[PDB]
Enzyme design. Structure first.
Site, PDB file in Angstrom:
ATOM      1  N   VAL A   1       5.773  -2.834   8.916  1.00 25.52           N
ATOM      2  CA  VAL A   1       6.699  -2.523   7.825  1.00 25.52           C
ATOM      3  C   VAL A   1       6.535  -1.068   7.393  1.00 25.52           C
ATOM      4  CG1 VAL A   1       7.627  -3.247   5.600  1.00 25.52           C
ATOM      5  CG2 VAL A   1       6.381  -4.884   7.045  1.00 25.52           C
TER       6      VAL A   1
ATOM      7  N   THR B   1      26.795 -12.618  23.440  1.00 23.35           N
ATOM      8  CA  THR B   1      25.399 -12.579  23.894  1.00 23.35           C
ATOM      9  C   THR B   1      24.659 -13.920  23.764  1.00 23.35           C
ATOM     10  OG1 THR B   1      24.559 -11.683  21.766  1.00 23.35           O
ATOM     11  CG2 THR B   1      25.179 -10.096  23.472  1.00 23.35           C
TER      12      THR B   1
ATOM     13  N   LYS C   1      14.995  -1.504   2.743  1.00 25.54           N
ATOM     14  CA  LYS C   1      15.751  -2.722   3.019  1.00 25.54           C
ATOM     15  C   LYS C   1      15.272  -3.875   2.148  1.00 25.54           C
ATOM     16  CE  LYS C   1      17.878  -1.226   6.832  1.00 25.54           C
ATOM     17  NZ  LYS C   1      17.493   0.214   6.922  1.00 25.54           N
TER      18      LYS C   1
ATOM     19  N   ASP D   1      13.178 -25.117  24.388  1.00 27.22           N
ATOM     20  CA  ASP D   1      13.433 -25.605  25.736  1.00 27.22           C
ATOM     21  C   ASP D   1      12.165 -26.208  26.339  1.00 27.22           C
ATOM     22  OD1 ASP D   1      11.896 -23.329  26.310  1.00 27.22           O
ATOM     23  OD2 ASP D   1      13.221 -22.621  27.893  1.00 27.22           O
TER      24      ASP D   1
HETATM   25 MG   LIG Z   1      10.333 -22.316  25.489  1.00 32.05          MG
HETATM   26 NA    NA Z   2      11.858 -21.240  28.715  1.00 29.08          NA
END
Ligand SMILES: [Mg+2]
Ligand code: NA
Ligand SMILES: [Mg+2]
Length: 323
Positions: free
Chosen positions: A55, A91, A62, A180
DNA sequence: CCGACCGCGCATCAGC
DNA sequence: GCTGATGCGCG
DNA sequence: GTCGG
């Protein structure tokens, strides 16, 4: 405690990455976001925040404005801009980065309808990312990660009882939900010394496809598979969402460096690796070696802790590496 | 001030 | 075909 | 954008 601040900075980091293509600004915001996220107090000022490393003056200003108003003018403007918004949106499709995103908006493709309309202008990875766009936005409850693990581990043991399949990523850090699934694979036939068997990864991708666990492929080489999987559902049960899956085959003797890498987090890996450089080592998913400023020979590693010892860090359990 | 910011697999393209 | 640069993704 | 030298 500091959700608003950390969200603010993450949105800023995304902007720099996707729109500005200034990766160091992206990393600057990400580091700051991470250091603040673990600060155990509710930040009352940007000065209180500046005491944390990462920081600086700019981010302090900000934080003061956000604290005052609950907003950042810079972001409220970025949000209002169409080019920037569209680019940032595109994106989010796996396979579309900052460059592709900007070319697409250039051609007038800037919404989810546009993408569907124009699939012939998409490469494979991009097409699959668009296909499962909604799915890939969902997180995975740990309970499903546990079922997914059982499947992968049991199937691999069927191709060859000598494979070792370890689930890494956030799952290994103990997260209650994962972005994931991340699978580290080893087989004794594959070492730093020799590859005694071809298609080690293939046979596994093959088997998981045969049982319809793996449904799609984003990319695939001799050591890295990046694709899509899905839990099987019951009679009349609505299907589970499709999930991203990454599989990484690593020299068996290099397991501990491999599992360090794949456990992450990403930010933690960047910090650990940078510290290693100051201490005079270089760390990749294979080896840690001593640094003319040029990498020496692989030092002997017998655990993840041995790596920590080298760079004079106290050991941190996986659950403490979620930076 | 200013240099340095990890490290690497796969897909794609240019250029030979 | 190859090499190397670049985009994208992984952590 | 931050920071270390
Ligand atoms: Mg992962
Ligand atoms: Na992954
Ligand atoms: Mg990730």
């Amino acid at each position: 405690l500091n959700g608003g601040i950390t969200d603010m900075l993450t949105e800023l980091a995304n902007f720099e990455k996707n729109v500005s293509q200034a990766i160091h600004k992206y990393n600057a915001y990400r580091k700051a976001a991470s250091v603040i996220a673990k600060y155990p107090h509710k930040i009352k000022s940007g000065a209180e925040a500046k005491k944390l490393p990462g920081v600086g003056t700019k981010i302090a200003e900000k934080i003061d404005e956000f604290l005052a108003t609950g907003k950042l003018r810079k972001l409220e403007k970025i949000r209002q801009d169409d080019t920037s918004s569209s680019i940032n949106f595109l994106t989010r499709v796996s396979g579309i980065g900052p460059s592709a995103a900007r070319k697409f908006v250039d051609e007038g493709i800037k919404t989810l309808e546009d993408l569907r309309k124009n699939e012939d202008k998409l490469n494979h990875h991009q097409r699959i990312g668009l296909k499962y766009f909604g799915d890939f936005e969902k997180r995975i409850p740990r309970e499903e990660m546990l079922q997914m693990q059982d499947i992968v581990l049991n199937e691999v043991k069927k191709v060859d009882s000598e494979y070792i399949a370890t689930v890494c990523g956030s799952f290994r850090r103990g997260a209650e939900s994962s972005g994931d699934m991340d699978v580290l694979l080893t087989h004794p036939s594959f070492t730093s010394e020799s590859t005694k068997q071809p298609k080690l990864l293939h046979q596994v991708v093959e088997q998981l496809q045969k049982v319809h666990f793996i449904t799609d492929t984003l990319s695939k080489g001799e050591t890295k598979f990046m694709g899509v999987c899905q839990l099987p559902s019951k009679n009349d049960e609505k299907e589970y969402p499709h999930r991203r899956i990454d599989i990484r085959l690593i020299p068996k003797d290099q397991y501990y460096c491999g599992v360090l890498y794949f456990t992450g987090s990403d930010i933690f890996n960047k910090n650990m690796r940078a510290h290693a450089l100051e201490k005079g080592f270089t760390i990749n998913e294979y080896t840690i070696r001593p640094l003319t400023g040029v990498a020496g020979e692989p030092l002997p590693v017998d655990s993840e802790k041995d790596i920590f010892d080298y760079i004079q860090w106290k050991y941190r359990e996986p659950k403490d590496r979620s930076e």
